[PDB]
């Protein structure tokens, strides 16, 4: 009757991994946004394409897939699964 | 009794995806660090890039031991 303990341990370990993967991607995209802005600022100092940088910049900040708020659902689903 | 085979087979495939995702972020992280240095070099021809550089390579979220640790937890689960 230890299947629930095995499943809960595996699912608890798995759910932790998704959260860690999410954090690194969010941390990277923040660096990329800062990375691009500093590049564009230097490009303007050299003297157009800044409209292109604005559009791709908004796409980075305007994601909708919502990688969070559903990992929380996954952690929830395990919780009432264990009490069985 | 077929549940044990399905559970182990499903968990093995999930672990493979976890390793592939973790490897793919690390390669991007190295490129971002390298890319910043090239732009930083062009700037001189200061600061707040060193702090970002230290932060990029200074993470303590592991992701190399937990995925490893997950692999064993499946293994004795297969023994049942």
């Amino acid at each position, epitope marked *: 009757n230890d299947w629930q303990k095995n499943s809960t341990r595996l699912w608890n370990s798995q759910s932790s991994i998704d959260q860690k993967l999410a954090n690194q991607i969010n941390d990277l995209r923040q660096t990329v946004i800062w990375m691009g802005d500093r590049l564009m600022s230097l490009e303007h100092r050299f003297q157009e394409s800044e409209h292109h940088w604005d559009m791709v910049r908004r796409h980075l900040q305007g994601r909708e897939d919502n990688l969070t708020l559903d990992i929380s659902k996954l952690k929830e689903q395990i919780f009432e699964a264990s009490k069985a | 009794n077929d549940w044990q085979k399905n559970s182990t087979r499903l968990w093995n495939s999930q672990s493979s995806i976890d390793q592939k995702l973790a490897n793919q972020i690390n390669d991007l992280r190295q490129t971002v660090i390298w890319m910043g240095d090239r732009l930083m070099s062009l700037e001189h021809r200061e600061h707040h890039w060193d702090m970002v550089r*230290r932060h990029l390579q200074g993470r*303590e979220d592991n992701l190399t031991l937990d995925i490893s640790k997950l692999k064993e937890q499946i293994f004795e689960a297969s023994k049942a």
Partner: antibody
Amino acid sequence: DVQLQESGPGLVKPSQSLSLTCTVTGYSITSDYAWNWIRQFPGNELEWMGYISYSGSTSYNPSLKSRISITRDTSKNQFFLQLNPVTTEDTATYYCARSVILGAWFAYWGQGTLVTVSA
Amino acid sequence: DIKMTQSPSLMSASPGEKVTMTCSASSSITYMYWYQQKPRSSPKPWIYLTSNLASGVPARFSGSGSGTSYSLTISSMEAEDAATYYCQQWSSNPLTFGAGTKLEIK
């Protein structure tokens, strides 16, 4: 070279708008870095409230995201905090902070103004 | 959110000794930071990424730790070191601060 100085009211009645200012000198709040708001309760507990980036992107603490809003004035080089409904639990000491854009490293702090909420 | 626990809440130590501070996280974190706040003053940044001392911090201070257990230690306690120390983690929104471990001079 970077100095943060906050000013605001000291007594605010319950269920009233709280306003604050942070005059930054020696640097431009549009050039780089993030600009945070932090408060300390009388039990010496620290809580982070939110920040506005150097481009205007803002994030807020989920525990109080509903009733908080941060804006700024580029020409005067100030960024402001607003907490529209307040209660006696908001008696704290509010601080400014400039942090690195990637992580949360408050390398500079304001003098620290005290706000007491009562009638 | 992540609950950051510091032990002990209050410690005393005569000058010249060696002291240690522990700040244990409820779950995994990404970055670790340390501050001090003397009375009637703003917190001062000292330690970032759990090992690097900020400018102005004397070499007698050092930080260490990994996983969910981080430590701040003083090789030789001096006079001006008596203050409340705060540990801060940054994993996701929002960031959480420690409870504050206050040091004393005996």
